[PDB]
Write an enzyme that holds these catalytic residues in place. Structure first.
Site, PDB file in Angstrom:
ATOM      1  N   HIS A  28       9.407   6.826  -4.031  1.00  0.00           N
ATOM      2  CA  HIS A  28      10.440   7.228  -4.978  1.00  0.00           C
ATOM      3  C   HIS A  28      11.770   7.552  -4.312  1.00  0.00           C
ATOM      4  O   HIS A  28      12.766   7.732  -5.021  1.00  0.00           O
ATOM      5  CB  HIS A  28       9.966   8.437  -5.786  1.00  0.00           C
ATOM      6  CG  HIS A  28       9.018   9.325  -5.042  1.00  0.00           C
ATOM      7  ND1 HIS A  28       7.649   9.192  -5.130  1.00  0.00           N
ATOM      8  CD2 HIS A  28       9.242  10.357  -4.197  1.00  0.00           C
ATOM      9  CE1 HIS A  28       7.071  10.102  -4.368  1.00  0.00           C
ATOM     10  NE2 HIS A  28       8.015  10.824  -3.792  1.00  0.00           N
ATOM     11  N   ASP A  50       0.927   5.320  -1.634  1.00  0.00           N
ATOM     12  CA  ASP A  50       2.035   5.538  -0.694  1.00  0.00           C
ATOM     13  C   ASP A  50       1.678   5.055   0.717  1.00  0.00           C
ATOM     14  O   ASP A  50       1.545   5.830   1.667  1.00  0.00           O
ATOM     15  CB  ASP A  50       2.484   7.006  -0.681  1.00  0.00           C
ATOM     16  CG  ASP A  50       3.857   7.179  -0.085  1.00  0.00           C
ATOM     17  OD1 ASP A  50       4.670   6.246  -0.228  1.00  0.00           O
ATOM     18  OD2 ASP A  50       4.124   8.234   0.527  1.00  0.00           O
ATOM     19  N   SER A 102      10.525  15.414  -0.259  1.00  0.00           N
ATOM     20  CA  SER A 102       9.263  14.720  -0.447  1.00  0.00           C
ATOM     21  C   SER A 102       8.609  14.412   0.894  1.00  0.00           C
ATOM     22  O   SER A 102       9.262  14.358   1.937  1.00  0.00           O
ATOM     23  CB  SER A 102       9.479  13.411  -1.199  1.00  0.00           C
ATOM     24  OG  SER A 102      10.300  12.542  -0.441  1.00  0.00           O
TER      25      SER A 102
END
Lengths: 151, 52, 49
Positions: A28, A50, A102
């Site tokens: 993202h 991911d 993140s």
């Protein structure tokens, strides 16, 4: 430890972790890495697991040792606090859970990586983190809370 | 018209009885979120499987 | 001509064997593909719990 920030017009909007065998970077987020030796990394997209391509050579390998399964519910070294649960993430207090951070690893007592945060800006009075976990033998599982915005 | 009345009076004894047992399938298990359901009643005998 | 030629008056038995092979095998090659995505979805669902 050793974790890298991702630059987008001079500001931080994510953190990229490295595990022995393959590097990691959230889907993202976007930007440029802050290393000359990580500037040749073949970036590729994946599913919500991911997965990034860890094409780094032997020069900086064996940085963070992976933690296996059978994880005890005890203490875990979060960068901005502590997490104490196994099945889901422990309710971290307010204030933490901003934006642009993140992919920060959650370490262990022996300096071993066990999970990578993905989202959950705010849930209310507490904060639940959507992390990646290994279930029983090492199969990677993406676990999410109800209505967790990416972060 | 008698054929579509016997069917419609027996199709309403389906959801009165199948959903009666389907409520009894799951209500001893949403009362226990810390216990895992058996795999026989997870998909085959009762519809709703384990979620997260 | 005394008879009346129809649409399927020219296809032999050997020519209809190649019709069924070219239809049956390639349609079943998508069924194997379609059953493959419904299996690894079930495997990754069982990895969730």
């Amino acid at each position: 430890d050793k974790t890298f920030p991702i630059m987008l017009n001079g500001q931080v909007n994510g953190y990229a972790c490295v595990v022995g065998g393959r590097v990691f970077k959230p889907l993202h987020v976007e930007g440029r890495i802050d290393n000359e030796q990580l500037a040749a990394i073949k970036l590729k997209k994946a599913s919500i697991y991911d997965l990034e391509y860890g094409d780094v050579p032997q020069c900086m390998k064996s940085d963070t040792l992976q933690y296996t399964s059978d994880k005890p519910p005890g203490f875990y070294n979060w960068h901005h606090g502590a997490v104490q649960y196994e099945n889901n993430r422990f309710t971290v207090p307010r204030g933490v859970g901003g934006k642009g951070d993140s992919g920060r690893p959650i370490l262990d007592n022996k300096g071993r990586v066990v999970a990578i945060v993905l989202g959950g800006v705010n849930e209310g009075s507490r904060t639940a983190l959507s992390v990646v976990t290994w279930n029983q033998k090492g199969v990677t599982v993406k676990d999410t809370p109800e209505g967790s915005e990416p972060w | 018209c008698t054929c579509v009345a016997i069917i419609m009076v027996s199709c309403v004894t389906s959801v009165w009885l199948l959903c009666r047992t389907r409520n009894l399938c799951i209500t001893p298990y949403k009362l226990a979120p810390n216990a895992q359901v058996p795999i026989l009643l997870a998909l085959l005998c009762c519809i709703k499987p384990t979620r997260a | 001509a005394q008879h009346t030629e129809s649409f399927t008056s020219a296809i032999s038995a050997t020519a209809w064997s190649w019709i069924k092979v070219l239809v049956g095998g390639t349609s079943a090659f998508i069924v194997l593909g379609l059953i493959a995505t419904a299996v690894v979805a079930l495997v990754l669902f069982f990895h969730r719990h």
